[PDB]
């Protein structure tokens, strides 16, 4: 390791990860400077039935670069594991989309060892990619528009944003109706599932198992169980996780890995050790809730005001915490810890 | 229409021209908010804010290279002015209706009213006039390079002993000479300024108490809040998230609500530059004895001999002067909001209006080797330029520009 | 004196300075700021202090300790107050 | 008064940043610079109101030390002397430091080293921290035949002849059986840092004395620290309101033959009765501090050019006579050591 | 005068009188004996590449050189200068050499005063000697007044054919000049008056060259689109001026991962050819270091790269050097990395000479950078401003040559080992350009970092070593085109 | 602008990077030889048919060096060779400045070269040339730069170095 | 009477334009000495121009526009100190913009116009 991947080195790393294992490398668009947004599909091309889509988007902010490296390493490790059980099953039952960098321009503009505590956080136009999404409360951000089109073109059910500047797992509704900076806890219809996903990701991390991050700037942000709500943490107008929850049916969680946004490459291996398990767990947490088939049909659960839509082949993946739920189709079901309960319509 | 500024040596002539455009009613009204007074049908001209005469570039050019400044005279061109100071002085109360910071803005004249003595304003002889400021001390537009407790030589011991031990390591009496390693115990010549302890409120709203203590826990005097009270440091080192509950000047961002303004909609002024002499507002002045020995934490400390304190900083948006009340006696007649306490302030003047003020500057002669701290605009690109009109045409002040940027020795 | 020390401002024009008006919502923590005006004239910013004298803070409040207050029964000279080798 | 002074090379002709952090206590943390300059201090009375002063610096000899050890005359060596008449340097006088002129004229004293303190955040420095290069001042150079002179006229100040900040009583006849010297001491708070209020405001002090509210002098041959009561010299100043501000008449602290003469009133927006708390005359423009330094005389530089600054100098020290003239058996040698038996007050 | 009387005082401060700033600085200097009082023919030939071949003479004389801005301006003085003035230029300097003392060293190492020894000091007021000043060499007066500095040895180069000399090669014996001889009690002094030189631009333009138009009124002239140049089609508008001349430089990224994996520092570097001897165009013509949002990139050899305190002479890492950025001249000067423009045949022009209507800014001066350079006495020259920045002077301050007089212990070659030391005081008066800007918003001013740091910037560390952490530029105020 | 100063910015959001601008529109030279202090941007001489000015920009954004000017804050040789070879926009002769290809219209006097092998050769000793004819702008302001070569306006002409109360504002 | 002619220079320079520096003192100005760590990888090394690396030193001036008849050992031979040789290139410039893959391409300047800091001599008379 001990090396960052730059222009045409990210593409080369993804190509060698594909060769290590299966993998399809493509681009969902281009950045402001025309730098392609590389996406690696592990399973462009047709959408296979029965495969719950998982997309892992990192490096939203250019200075946040642990995400890029851990995404590359995760793709390589998944390819090697499939080539060599757990990873084989994960790649056989789950379609995993790996997007190492949504802001390659900012990553190039980022500097060595700044750590966060001008910097490349925004794209080439100075617009934050995390502040350029529609919120329930373009043409200047081609990466954001490209990702919006990519989400609209697919049916992602679980997703993970990897960030920097903190060590925490934030779940959706990063903004609030009153738009107060902190304090206000914005609860979603699927808040329990988001909490379960954030807890599952944070438990495996050797740092987020304790809510306190031990890094400059806060020194006292003792997150409960290593997870937090975005609005409860700090308000973000037009975030992407809230968009993915509202305008899409995806369950998208932000994951701040380290408080040093751009660590020296020597730390990368260590950071990999801090995430290798966690990322995999997150992906293998998409097999929860219920799964089944019914064709652009609305699927709803009683007691929750959030309705999902079946995919092109009628496949729906309703992520849920274990329990008994009343499923409804518009055009008692038991959930247990483990594989999704199969219900047909 | 002059609206110019000329820098000639130690003088600066700041003139500003603005375009300007009611009802006697017996007005009256918790027991602490009751009032009685009269609403006159007169409008009054107010220019008691620094931005009414100084542009942001002028303010930078003033605070970056001058240790002090004070007004000398003003010419006002346009109705009467109370030159003999008969009417109640409503200026200096940090009220609105002042000349707009942006010369292109058209403002309306605020209505004049007073509180109680009935004053009929048509009982006065009712355009241009000139006023000359009385000799007022220079505003300390500087920070102190040294703290009050670090004015000694860090290499030489003191010849004065301090009682360092009272018990053998039985009880005894031991004395030691104050030195570099025991600076806290060295004999000193001066004490920090007076303290009127205030409640600490964190900008991180999570750390604050889950109660509405904005008024109940306030630092009111007998019940009106001591806002901002005596000049004290806003916070100590690495505590910029804290501020006294009502011990700082808080300005309004553009389009900020009159009430229920969120923390993002207001601009807090930090008086930390005076922490070298003034005790932190949210912390105690010190510890005195009470009687096993007993120690009492003194919170409100009055004036003591040897005390030295800095006044509250003035700001581009802050008030310029305030009338010293015609009382029998006073202690350090300086406005608590900051500015120049004038026994005979500019008379309140009860189309276009031009006001020019001559300010005498104190050119700094500092032999400090390293570069100073100057006020600068962020080089990084922004959606809109700071201190400039936006797309809609609304001129806004993004931050409250302080005044103490150069440094000085105590 | 025909007018009081805390009532020498305009009773028609509100101030441009903000004061901390509320900290708890109407209940969680918040930070509300209001402009002192004709109605809330006790909270208006003043330039001078009187020559119990007043109420001061007695501790550092936090999310666990309520801020208690101290009644000042003897107040010495302070800047802005209006009413041998040295004398006052 | 004329005294013989010796001045060595300080910091080896270097400006050394000095600092102490907690990694000690926060109350003792400091940041500053130690300069190669010494300074002339005559702020003690043994070195009414002052009117003026004349200051002379003559009979200067600069001597080389060669290592056996031999000391030889250096006729061409100079010394740099300047007074900060504009008070642009941190005024370290008035803190009652050692190194002043000896009370006995026959005694030869070493010039105290001049260092200053500045703003700090623990052991680290803040942006407001200032660095003063004393070579950045116009300073007169003196050889063996040159002499320095300057006259300073004192500003008007009241002749040297109430509020309380209660102290903790201590009995000379040894008091509680605990170490209450600092925990129970009357302190004040500044920037989250507790500083001992020594000696505090002028208040009355026979066995009783305030814990830190009096000036304590040192007997001849007294320990630097942990000195016994027999080795020190106590000065006598002969709803419960424990601290009272201005409301009221009072008297200033008495000045002593061993005590300071004057102190600099800090350049501040306001001050209440700016009389120094250790006694003396508070001066807005005090006698400027005289800074003196042996001019660095380098040893032989290399034959080939080297960009790095010279770090090898000949060992030099300058002695001379300093005369200060201010217009306004007990106390005798024993072994020939001058001793001051009891502190003398002017009241 | 005399052995035991000081020959001068330590004058080192700055005085600001309106539009004038007089900066005087005194330093302690130590001049050794160079070459054992011998003139040595030095040379490098191919048998070393042909580009590095030289022929010249090394003289026993040292030379005083105060051609760096930090020799006279303190960092606070520099901040005063660049935060308040649109321009500055030297007016006159006074140079003094005093408290001279010559010491002889004897080895058995004992150093003793030699009262009767003299030193020879002279100034080439007629510029008859080769001018080695302005070449940005070490040996300047230290930025810190407390630093005692070595006097650099004086040598010169002449025409060469490889390591050999030619008929036109000139040998300059510095003893042939009338030099004032000084004992311990003597002092040297002279006054030089700077010739009329344009003010240095201590400002960065508020307007780019292509954005001088009214963004609301369409042009009355047409361009072959036909259309009138307007706000939306702002790049097609007819314009009065062209950017400055260009000489394309290779782009290098400070983020080393983005650079090519080759040792292109020399082969790909921008060079000029002279007498078959390729030389590096360092720092080349004044061009913008990088365009917008490209601060990581820099021209390969088109910038001034200063050295941090205690930095290696060779193979110094990027952390040990401070890169100057000429991004303040993006408004008029073309970017040093990419091409000047496109012509038709189309073809991109990488090097563009002077064209009518072209306007450009000179290279910025820095606190550690050179102050002046001597314009070569040539028939033709174009915009004679030094390429490292500063002031191009036909008659620069004369170089002061100082040498210990040999004391003997065929020609005599046994001399007693001597070295002199003393004080050098240089005082330069600069005429300031007061700024009269009706700009409303505040601009960029040079300020020190507020946040706490281990040591103060532009101050000594714990070990007593004065360091300059960053290269302070000069263009912080703004002036519209 | 209804007595208002309006910020005007045009980024790449249709328009390309070469057409981006930032400036302010304030509410406030056509045919031998022929704000007094020149403290405002001199939009004259750009051959226009309301006063508004431009400043430094990075796309639609404005860098900190951008200057905002409030206008209420106010009280040559006789007119009679170098080559920059000419040829609509892709093949047109342009010059590069801060990553922005600006059309070289009308360029130096000799596609976009009129008012409506060596291709580019700079100044050489002994070279003689004539300025563009006038028809057309009388003059233009020479930008205040340290250096300029033949500071004659390429568009033609003469190069002159000095050619109940409410707090809310009423609207 | 003749006008103010520029006083034709009937001399020959004794110093070349690229050898105007002191051959004994290093330059305080650094230059990019190398970019590849001598498997080789990428770095950024800087070196000070000195007596040995003379061609890499920083210099204030440039040779005249692209003139000397010939270089050494091959008539305007007297002006080769300042003017470039008439029968070769003016200098070496950057042709492309490098990347990870795009090795830097190089351009030979044959005709160079006037540049700032450029000095030159005039042809001799006979």
From Swiss-Prot, chain A:
Coiled coil: none
Modified residue annotations for Phosphoserine: 176
Domain of life: Eukaryota
Region entry Disordered, spans: 110-138
List of glycosylated residues: 92, 130, 296, 307, 326
Cellular compartment(s): Cell membrane
Recorded family membership: Belongs to the peptidase M14 family.
Protein name (record): Carboxypeptidase D
Taxonomic source organism: Homo sapiens (Human)
Name of encoding gene: CPD
Parent-record interval covered: 55 to 457 of 1380
